[PDB]
Amino acid sequence: LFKARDWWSTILGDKEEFDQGCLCLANVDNSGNGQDKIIVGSFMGYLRIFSPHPAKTGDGAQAEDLLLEVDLRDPVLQVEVGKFVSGTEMLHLAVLHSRKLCVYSVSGTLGNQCQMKLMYEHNLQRTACNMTYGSFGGVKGRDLICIQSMDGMLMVFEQESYAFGRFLPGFLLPGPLAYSSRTDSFLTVSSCQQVESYKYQVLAFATDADKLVVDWTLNIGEQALDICIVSFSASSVFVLGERNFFCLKDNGQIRFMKKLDWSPSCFLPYCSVSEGTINTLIGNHNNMLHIYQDVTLKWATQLPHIPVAVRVGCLHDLKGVIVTLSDDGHLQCSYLGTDPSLFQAP
């Protein structure tokens, strides 16, 4: 419908591959102006951090958009940013690899325009799938990390130290994973198409699953692509299925659901523009990017490439900037649709 109001794009490396998990938007250098940076890891082992600026010429020398590029020499499965270091609330970068989790401190402005120093790393006893993080147990001021292994163990790390590991029951292939702070629970979706919620303390105290009962379960009748837990005060569990999009109450009841008319590739519940409603971005395999308010389509744009991940954040000193990443490394920043009361063509 609308073309993208893009203002920056790049191509990451040479025939590199990416998936959901590889894109993070966060104030990873703890800057005072509160701007996000784009962090992207690739399956080719490169970690890149950008602070994009629109084209600006005739003013001599502009600082590079690329703040940092490092070859981690190990495929990157996921990147996240959070309070991963004990004794400080500063944000740090977690990089998930198949057999290790590495946590880094990224400096402000100092080739590379900042430094990235390893704070600690955990060597994993099992191959990793994906991870989530948060204030497990209701601890304030720190983000613990939970990694799901390929064979279905949830491995919990209390920042610099390993806490425990528990095998999921009813497990076949690893599904998406998310932490709900409101219910202090881990959410996933199993191969037999059950959304499952596990209480953190039940996990912690189920000492007999390291070789565990679900809190609630919901059969959604299809495979899940992603889960996103958001609150913009009443918490919601969003599930992106292959055929449907779901919004669940914390207790596992469906709040609403919507049949999708196109195969989705990725999504992001990203804001609320009115009380009781939520806006969700959904990218698809036909290069379209959609915005729904609850289940109602509000806006649509064609992208040049199929997004495997989409994020919204603060870039170029503007809020609500859309960042998309394709599976072959096309990275693009764009602005949302324009106010229709401000312009209409004759």
Q: For residue 13, which of 330, 332, 304 has the smallest C-alpha distance?
A: 330
Helix (H) and strand (E) counts for the chain? 1, 29
Residue at token pair 């064979």: 151
10 Å Cβ neighbour count for 296?
9
Which CA distances in Å does 207 have to 146, 165, 203, 213, 288? Answer: 16, 9, 8, 12, 47
Query: What per-residue string of b and e applies to 66-77 under the rule 16 or more CB within 10 Å gives b?
Result: bbbbeebebebb
Experimental technique, in short, is X-ray
| Residue in the block written with tokens 């394709």 | 326
Judging by beta carbons within 10 Å of its beta carbon (0-12, 13-18, 19+), is residue 278 exposed, middle or buried?
A: buried
Beta carbons of 16 and 75 less than 8 angstroms apart: no
Cβ atoms of residues 269 and 280 within 8 Å: yes
Give the CA-trace dihedral at 132, 197, 237, 130, to 10 degrees. Answer: 20
Please count the structural domains in the chain.
1
Nearest Cα neighbor of 147 from 135, 161, 129 is: 129
Question: Strands of 153-158's sheet, edge to edge?
Answer: 128-134, 144-149, 153-158, 161-167
> DSSP state, 193?
S
Beta bridge partners of 302: 3, 288
- Cβ atoms of residues 74 and 100 within 8 Å: yes
What letter would DSSP give residue 137? G
Burial class (CB in 10 A: 0-12, 13-18, 19+), 301: buried
H or E stretch at 163: strand 161-167
Burial profile 130-139: b = 16 or more Cβ within 10 angstroms, e = fewer:
bbbbbbbeee
Q: What is the resolution of this structure in A?
A: 1.8
Domain region containing 15: 1-346
> Which of 16, 62, 66, 9 lies closest to 41 in space, CA to CA?
16
Paired strand residues for 41? 47
Strand (E) or helix (H) holding 180: strand 177-180
Under DSSP, the state recorded for 310 is: E
Length of the chain: 346
What does the alpha-carbon distance between residue 95 and residue 107 come to, in Å, rounded to a whole number?
16
Note whether 279 and 16 are within 8 A (CB).
no
* Sheet order of strands, 5-11 included: 5-11, 330-335, 318-326, 307-315
